Every structure is written in C-alpha cells, then in structure tokens.
Amino acid sequence: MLDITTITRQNVTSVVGYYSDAKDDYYSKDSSFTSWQGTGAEALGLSGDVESARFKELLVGEIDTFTHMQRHVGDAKKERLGYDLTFSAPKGVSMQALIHGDKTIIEAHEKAVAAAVREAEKLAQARTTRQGKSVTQNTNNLVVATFRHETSRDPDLHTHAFVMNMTQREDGQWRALKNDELMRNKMHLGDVYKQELALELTKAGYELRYNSKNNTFDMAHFS
Ligand SMILES: [Mn+3]
C-alpha cells in the first residue's frame, strides 16, 4: 500500500527519475505519468509534466543556480535527499487498470495519491530559531514529483510520490524537512490513500469486496 524509502547520497542512483534520455526534456511529455504536486512545488512555479533536469536539481537541493541548500551537518553521504512514498493499488484494482485497460481505475488511483499527498503536507515541518531558542515551524508545504508506473507484468499499479527534502519557511527560506511527523504517520498516509481509492471507485459505480480482518478492500470478483 505505502512504502517509504529514504533517499540519501548512498542510494540516489536507485531513485525514480534519476536517469533520463538526453533527447528529451521530460520523461513523458503530454501525459499524466508524471506530475508536480504539493504547495511547495507551486511556490516554485512547477506544475504538469516533470522536467528531468529540474527534478535532479531539486533532488540535491538546487533551488536555483544561486541557491543550493545546506542540509549536511555531519557525514556528507548521509544527507537525506528525499523520501519516496510509493502508493500501490490492491491486486484486483491493478488487474482492472492494467490488464483490462480501465482508465477509470487510473484516475481514481491518481486522486487517492493526490489526497494522500495533501495529507502529507500537513505534517511538513522545519527547524527555526526564534530568539536564540529553537522552535519547530509547521510549514504545510511540500515539493513532490510523482511518477506513475504501469507494470502489466503480475499487475502492479503504483505511483512514486517523491517528496523532496525541502520545505519553504515563513521567511521564504528553503530548508530541510524535519521528517519526524512524516515518518510516524506512514500508516495514516497509507490509509488515506486506501480510503480515497475505495471512495472514488465506489463513486464510479464499482463493486468492492471488503476484508474485515485487516480492514482492506479489493475489486469484487478479482484478486
Ligand atoms: Mn515503480
């Protein structure tokens, strides 16, 4: 449902969107496979398809050519670059989307990810210094690059919602995410995705089967 991978300098080459084709500015232009999300992304003037060069700049804290974030206070290879929140659809749902080509499923999946992303924003914090003392500021803004993967084979519909390690403070300064609230809310975020997906599917008219034991769902008549 939800997996959270912490990306650092040690595992960066495994992050979604790290590689791209030289000829292309975008990974997939004129489609919904990628998109910028979050209030931080909008504050940066970012929306629609994700430009690979920009994604990679933000990955390593490059707000712009004159503005590189300092997030390293300790071993430099330990610096967190971001968090991959991977939202995976139930198996029957993936089958309906990928094996039956049901575009409605894709849309509901996207809505559910957007909803979970918005909930994630509530948990965004940054350290600051009021008057000599340190205080945690609720910033309510994230920069997120999302990449949808449609793996036809054992069907697996999921989206990588990559949360940059940054948030915009009240003073306009970009600082590292204080990830504590995010990390202890992994289960909550996963349930938000699950609930919104069920809600959207139900609204479209789909019959869903509920598993009381572990409080999950999947398409009625399907894995
Ligand atoms: Mn993937």
- Is 19 noted as a catalytic residue in this protein? yes
Could you give the residue ranges of the DSSP H alpha helices within 81-185? Answer: 91-98, 103-121, 180-183
Look up tokens 């495994």; give the residue. Answer: 14
CA distance to 58, 61, 62, 143, per residue, from 65 (Å): 11, 10, 7, 18
User: What is the span of the domain harbouring residue 55?
Assistant: 1-223
Amino acid identity of residue 98, one-letter, is L
Are 162 and 56 in contact, with CB atoms under 8 Å apart?
A: no
Q: Collapsing DSSP states into helix, strand and coil, what is residue 117?
A: helix
Active site residue 193: no
83: CA distance to ligand 1 center in Å? 14
Given a contact cutoff of 8 angstroms between Cβ atoms, the answer to whether 2 and 86 are in contact is yes
Residues linked to residue 64 through DSSP beta bridges, in sequence order: 67
Residues 6+ apart with CB under 8 A from 139: 124, 125, 126, 167, 168, 169, 170
CA atoms within 13 A on the CB side of 67: 9
**Considering 19, 26, 27, 210, which one is annotated as catalytic?**
19
- Span from the CA of 178 to the centroid of ligand 1 (angstroms): 25
Elucidation method: X-ray
Say which DSSP state 10 is in.
T
In the numeric block, the tokens 């609230």 are attached to 181
Our count of domains for the chain comes to 1
